[PDB]
């Protein structure tokens, strides 16, 4: 989950055609490659602010804690025993 | 009369394939209900 840790800024992708000669993934977008890295959510909204770039923001999805019992695995009365092991 | 010569475990040598399945099946009157979880299975 390192990945996971920082918020990130990108921008739309514009059109990627075929080069006539190679077949190579020719562009015309200069930002195609930029991905800015950020610590928090409001020092990204600052920075697309402070440079005129219009922006939406998807909030941080964290996993919501999960309930783990090992013992769960062979109950006497539930359906949450495993069939195998 | 006291007899430490003898091996009195003579039975074995008259067991057959179904011995234990069939001493299971003549001990299947003398037990108690079974205990139930309230399911048929963990399936269901």
């Known amino acids: 989950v390192n990945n996971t840790k ?12 075929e080069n006539p000669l190679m077949g ?3 562009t015309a977008d200069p930002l195609s490659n930029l991905v800015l890295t950020f610590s ?19 909030e941080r999805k964290v996993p919501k804690p999960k309930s783990k019992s090992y013992g769960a695995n062979f109950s006497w009365n539930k359906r949450t025993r495993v069939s195998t092991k | 009369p006291f ?10 040598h008259d067991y057959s394939t179904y011995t234990f399945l069939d001493l299971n099946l003549d001990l299947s009157k003398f037990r108690m209900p079974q205990p139930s979880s309230g399911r048929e299975s963990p399936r269901h």
């Open chain 1, 24 to 26: 190579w993934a020719s």
């Open chain 1, 40 to 58: 928090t959510k409001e020092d990204a909204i600052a920075f697309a602010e402070k440079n005129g770039w219009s922006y939406d923001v998807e």
């Open chain 1, 6 to 17: 920082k918020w990130k800024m990108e921008f739309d992708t514009r059109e990627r055609w």
């Open chain 2, 3 to 12: 007899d430490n010569t003898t091996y009195k475990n003579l039975q074995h």
